[PDB]
Design a protein around this nucleic acid. Structure first.
Lengths: 104, 105
DNA sequence: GAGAAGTGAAAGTACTTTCACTTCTC
DNA sequence: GAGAAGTGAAAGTACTTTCACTTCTC
């Protein structure tokens, strides 16, 4: 009965993905819009990916790389969660990202 | 993009020919023969229960497990959840017994 | 008597499943 | 300018998906 979002990110920020616990409450998430030219699936759409294969939406070695979704699924999720509010001061545009507080 | 949900499946299912009635233009029955009673034929009791399981896709004919106990639970439980179908509960048990409900109008 | 069958409720994905017992049937 | 990508919210099975738009990026 594996973790649920507040966990997966909790841990996932505690290892080495690519964003931070820029605080001991708050964290970041690489929201590079994916039309920006410097967009590498393997560098931006990661957590997004981790989580989809984690939660079992996708499975590496699959034919749908579709990380747009991976992002939505992940966006929406982060939405729902009640113990992680995105500190809205940051609807970022370039060298962009989304920011949230974990409800303590 | 979805099929009907319980209040429908039964609505229709009582409007055809299964084995229970719209013993009213609000209320209906459901063959709850306990299944240890000796006169228990899967094909005669555990039907709707079945329709629904293969309907909702739980089972699909020709599948290694007719298990209609479940069919019954899945169906019992469901009927429970639904908010627009209240079983008028003051009812009968044992030997050709059935459950009765009103559809909230 | 006791093993198949049944439940409701609550926790998982608008029904389902699962949990934790509880009835039945002979 | 315009087409790929993004959204939030709401309706489907605690995330997902789907709806109905809306932003980006160059």
């Amino acid at each position: 009965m594996r973790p649920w979002l507040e966990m997966q990110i909790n841990s996932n920020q505690i290892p080495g993905l690519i964003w931070i616990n820029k605080e001991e409450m708050i964290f970041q998430i690489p929201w590079k819009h994916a039309a920006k030219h410097g967009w590498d699936i393997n560098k931006d759409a990661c957590l997004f990916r981790s989580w989809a294969i984690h939660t079992g939406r996708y499975k590496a070695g699959e034919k749908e790389p579709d990380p747009k979704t991976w992002k939505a699924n992940f966006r929406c999720a982060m939405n729902s969660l009640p113990d992680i509010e995105e500190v809205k001061d940051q609807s970022r545009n370039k060298g962009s990202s989304a920011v949230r507080v974990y409800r303590m």
